[PDB]
Scaffold this motif. Structure first.
Motif, PDB file in Angstrom:
ATOM      1  N   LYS A  25       0.851  -1.198   0.000  1.00 50.72           N
ATOM      2  CA  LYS A  25       0.000   0.000   0.000  1.00 50.72           C
ATOM      3  C   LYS A  25       0.873   1.229   0.000  1.00 50.72           C
ATOM      4  CE  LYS A  25      -4.086  -2.011   2.195  1.00 50.72           C
ATOM      5  NZ  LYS A  25      -3.600  -3.405   2.033  1.00 50.72           N
ATOM      6  N   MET A  26       0.286   2.321  -0.446  1.00 54.29           N
ATOM      7  CA  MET A  26       1.009   3.569  -0.515  1.00 54.29           C
ATOM      8  C   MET A  26       0.047   4.669  -0.081  1.00 54.29           C
ATOM      9  SD  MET A  26       2.682   5.303  -3.927  1.00 54.29           S
ATOM     10  CE  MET A  26       2.615   3.728  -4.750  1.00 54.29           C
ATOM     11  N   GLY A  27       0.600   5.643   0.618  1.00 52.88           N
ATOM     12  CA  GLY A  27      -0.178   6.822   1.002  1.00 52.88           C
ATOM     13  C   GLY A  27       0.666   8.083   0.993  1.00 52.88           C
ATOM     14  N   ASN A  37      -4.673  12.676  -1.413  1.00 53.76           N
ATOM     15  CA  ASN A  37      -4.779  11.687  -2.500  1.00 53.76           C
ATOM     16  C   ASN A  37      -3.487  11.744  -3.262  1.00 53.76           C
ATOM     17  OD1 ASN A  37      -7.966  12.988  -3.578  1.00 53.76           O
ATOM     18  ND2 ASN A  37      -7.612  11.268  -2.158  1.00 53.76           N
ATOM     19  N   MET A  38      -3.034  10.607  -3.718  1.00 50.06           N
ATOM     20  CA  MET A  38      -1.795  10.573  -4.480  1.00 50.06           C
ATOM     21  C   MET A  38      -2.013  10.972  -5.939  1.00 50.06           C
ATOM     22  SD  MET A  38      -0.240   7.165  -2.836  1.00 50.06           S
ATOM     23  CE  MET A  38      -1.717   6.188  -3.089  1.00 50.06           C
ATOM     24  N   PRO A  39      -1.267  11.993  -6.433  1.00 53.72           N
ATOM     25  CA  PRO A  39      -1.479  12.371  -7.828  1.00 53.72           C
ATOM     26  C   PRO A  39      -0.825  11.360  -8.759  1.00 53.72           C
ATOM     27  CG  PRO A  39       0.103  13.844  -6.811  1.00 53.72           C
ATOM     28  CD  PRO A  39      -0.249  12.842  -5.782  1.00 53.72           C
ATOM     29  N   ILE A  53       7.397   9.285 -10.300  1.00 55.42           N
ATOM     30  CA  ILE A  53       6.016   9.246 -10.757  1.00 55.42           C
ATOM     31  C   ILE A  53       5.337   8.025 -10.171  1.00 55.42           C
ATOM     32  CG2 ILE A  53       4.481   8.912 -12.774  1.00 55.42           C
ATOM     33  CD1 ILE A  53       6.798   9.907 -14.520  1.00 55.42           C
ATOM     34  N   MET A  54       4.093   8.182  -9.744  1.00 58.97           N
ATOM     35  CA  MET A  54       3.304   7.083  -9.243  1.00 58.97           C
ATOM     36  C   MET A  54       2.330   6.677 -10.354  1.00 58.97           C
ATOM     37  SD  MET A  54       2.470   8.570  -5.216  1.00 58.97           S
ATOM     38  CE  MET A  54       1.509   9.920  -5.901  1.00 58.97           C
ATOM     39  N   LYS A  55       2.297   5.393 -10.738  1.00 63.91           N
ATOM     40  CA  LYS A  55       1.333   4.895 -11.723  1.00 63.91           C
ATOM     41  C   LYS A  55       1.035   3.424 -11.446  1.00 63.91           C
ATOM     42  CE  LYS A  55      -0.073   6.140 -16.327  1.00 63.91           C
ATOM     43  NZ  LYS A  55      -0.251   7.519 -16.896  1.00 63.91           N
TER      44      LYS A  55
END
Ligand SMILES: [Cu+]
Length: 66
Positions: A25-27, A37-39, A53-55
């Motif tokens: 999980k990531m926050g 919220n994660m962009p 970058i988070m994807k």
């Protein structure tokens, strides 16, 4: 944040933090500890100059080879 189950934190230039947990999980929290919220798909710069970058719930980091 339950830092004992955090495996990596990214400290962003704007003072926010991204935390990745042992279970995948990531926050994210801003500089005041407010949840964010994660962009997804947004380039974000860390305090040490790394860009991420988070994807797809995964973190991509600038290729150090280049
Ligand atoms: Cu994320």
């Amino acid at each position: 944040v339950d830092m004992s189950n955090v495996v990596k934190t990214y400290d962003l230039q704007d003072g926010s933090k991204v935390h990745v947990f042992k279970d995948g999980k990531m926050g994210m929290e801003n500089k005041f500890g407010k949840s964010m919220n994660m962009p997804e798909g947004k380039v974000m710069e860390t305090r040490d100059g790394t860009k991420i970058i988070m994807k797809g719930n995964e973190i991509f980091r600038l290729d150090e080879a280049l």
